[PDB]
């Protein structure tokens, strides 16, 4: 059909803002609305990644999951010109993202919210008093490790200050710093983990995960015991051995039914949410590549 949007800007653009902008003439962008006439508002992620309010990872994933993505194609001060990304077609995307990861033919690119420093994901347009923020695009296997390692870095870095003698930060850094993949080694730039809670964009997700893991074994056994009938899964009775002696010791009588069901329900909510998160909802396949051209045929 026709797929294109021209976004007008308020004022003209300063020079070193135009060249800086040109440097990303092949990357992806999260839109606001599906119309061929839009302001600059709702085009990056600062709409949900501003500097005033605290960044929430989950708040950004809940927006990337349900939005429209597009590719830049022309940038010339007075207006930008992009093209939507709707299924049923093949687009051509040019890899340029400051923390750089070498792509391979026949992979599956995953758009993940920026976890690295802000300057490697954002571009400011001060002529218009607007920052545009770009989502991070990694090959699915890589993101699979980069999201677990950073999250465990959060945990360790918090608990070591909470309790000194639990571990050594040096065991944390040399372990989690490097991520290696497919005959390639990559070195993470870690976010230095500021102390107080809530001001870590991973703090919320770490809370979700840890509360889930603290609540799991209490409800697991109860759910196991209640199930058994004359006719049930053989495999259930089988795995009923696997659980440690410790958990099978827990007595359901001690917990009150109100609190018990509270744990049950909140834990199930946390599971249903968290497991969905890991799937890396916006994911797109790769068919071809060029290392010298930085071109990937994706869809």
């Amino acid at each position: 059909m026709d797929l294109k949007v021209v976004v007008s800007l308020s004022s003209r653009l300063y020079t070193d803002e135009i060249a800086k902008m040109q440097q990303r003439i092949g990357c992806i962008l999260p839109l606001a609305s599906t119309h061929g006439t839009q302001n600059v508002q709702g085009l990056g992620l600062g709409q949900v990644y501003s500097l005033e309010t605290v960044p929430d990872y989950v708040s950004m994933y809940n927006y990337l999951s349900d939005c429209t993505l597009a590719v830049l194609d022309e940038v010339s001060v007075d207006s930008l010109i992009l093209t939507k990304i709707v299924p049923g077609q093949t687009y051509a995307i040019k890899n340029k993202y400051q923390p750089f990861f070498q792509w391979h033919g026949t992979g599956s690119l995953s758009v993940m919210p920026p976890v690295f420093g802000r300057e490697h994901a954002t571009v400011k347009l001060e002529s218009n008093d607007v920052d545009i923020v770009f989502p991070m695009v990694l090959p699915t296997p890589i993101a699979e490790e980069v999201l677990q390692k950073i999250l465990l870095f959060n945990v360790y870095s918090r608990v070591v200050m909470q309790a000194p003698g639990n571990a050594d930060m040096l065991d944390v850094h040399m372990h989690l710093g490097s991520v290696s993949y497919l005959g390639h080694h990559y070195e993470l730039a870690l976010p230095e983990v500021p102390g107080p809670l809530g001001l870590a964009l991973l703090d919320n997700l770490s809370l979700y995960f840890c509360i889930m893991v603290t609540l799991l074994p209490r409800a697991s056994m109860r759910l196991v015991r209640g199930l058994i009938r004359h006719e049930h899964h053989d495999l259930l009775n089988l795995f009923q051995e696997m659980v440690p002696d410790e958990i099978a010791r827990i007595d359901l009588d001690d917990l009150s039914v109100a609190d018990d069901l509270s744990r049950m329900r909140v834990m199930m909510t946390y599971l249903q949410s968290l497991a969905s998160l890991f799937n890396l909802g916006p994911r797109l396949a790769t068919a071809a590549y060029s290392q010298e051209t930085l071109t990937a045929t994706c869809w």
């Binding site: 005959g183 053989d234 089988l238 068919a287």
Partner: protein, 336 residues
């Protein structure tokens, strides 16, 4: 005397009427007329195989603004689509002449394992019988007839024993899809396949290739399980399994639904799972993973199965064929 104040209907009616025409469908035929031209117009699919001359290029219309060639090469308006027609995307493979047997069936889909050498320029692909070769009167005879000296394959992945014990063999391997064209050379063969689209032949002489799987591996999930309706699409899967014999590769096909398919899988594997996990070896951490599944695409149902007997070196092989398959590869899912 009114000084023009905007774009006018001219240059607008032209653009819009050409943008306008909708596809024809539901033409009425009368047994009196019984045949017409517009009937043919509805009929023709407009295949694109242009034949190398300048004027013929345009006549075929392979030179057309739309990704699909349109009639006459963009002169007419068109129908802005063809029932969601997406030209199949193709994958170009360069395979060592030893790993792949040229006499293989063309319908057979392919699998490539991820090699981990710096800047790998030659890759190693695997077909079902080949994977059966690696992981070690039935298949075995026909396989050993097709592939000899399995070390010629085993040296491709110098990590096989490590991955089978590490239960990570499933995650590396990516399927691609069915075979399309084949050129045979002494050193490195030229092979090309298709991913994410209708399975089709690219040869100038037209041929309709149908995906094939040998009968020992393929297991119809809906066959052995038995109101229920029959929908249009029927989906095919691969499943990898680490049994105490070894990694054992099979197949699965049904329309029953994903959440349902994972469940039927458990009841299917349960007795095998029991002895696998039983007294023989208790278990560590990584070892717990047992198998993995993937979705292989859509195949119109009620078409069902024919069984084609493949011939090689004076021996018969029983093989099932599924027609008009549409390639759509999905990722891997643990089953336990």
């Amino acid at each position: 005397m009114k000084v023009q104040g905007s774009v006018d209907r001219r240059r607008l009616q032209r653009r819009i009427a050409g943008l306008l025409p909708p596809p024809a469908r539901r033409l009425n035929i009368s047994r009196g007329s019984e045949f017409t031209r517009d009937v043919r117009g509805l009929v023709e699919e407009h295949a694109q195989a242009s034949s190398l001359s300048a004027a013929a290029v345009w006549r075929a219309g392979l030179l057309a603004p739309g990704e699909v060639a349109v009639a006459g090469g963009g002169s007419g308006g068109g129908s802005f689509s063809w029932s969601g027609w997406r030209p199949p995307v193709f994958g170009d493979f360069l395979i060592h002449a030893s790993s792949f047997n040229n006499a293989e069936a063309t319908g057979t889909p392919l699998f490539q394992f991820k090699q981990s050498d710096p800047f790998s320029g030659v890759d190693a692909v695997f077909t079902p019988l080949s994977l059966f070769i690696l992981m070690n009167g039935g298949l075995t005879r026909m396989a050993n007839l097709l592939y000899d000296s399995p070390a010629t394959l085993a040296d491709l992945v110098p990590d096989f024993g490590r991955l089978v014990a590490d239960r990570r063999f499933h995650n590396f391997i990516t399927p691609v899809g069915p075979l399309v064209e084949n050129i045979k050379s002494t050193y490195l063969n030229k092979i090309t396949t298709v991913v994410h689209g209708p399975v089709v032949s690219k040869a100038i002489p037209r041929s309709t290739v149908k995906v094939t799987v040998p009968q020992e591996a393929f297991v119809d999930l809906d066959a052995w399980l038995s109101l229920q309706p029959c929908p249009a699409d029927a989906r095919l899967y691969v499943a990898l399994t680490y049994e105490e014999a070894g990694p054992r590769f099979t197949f699965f096909q049904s329309s029953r639904g994903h959440c349902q398919i994972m469940n039927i899988l458990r009841i299917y594997y349960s007795p095998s799972i029991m002895h696998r996990y039983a007294v023989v070896q208790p278990l560590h951490i990584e070892e717990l993973t047992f198998g993995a599944v993937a979705c292989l695409g859509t195949f119109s149902a009620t078409d069902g199965w024919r069984r084609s007997a493949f011939n090689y070196r004076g021996s018969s092989l029983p093989v099932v064929e599924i027609d008009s398959f549409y390639s759509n590869v999905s990722d891997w899912e643990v089953i336990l």
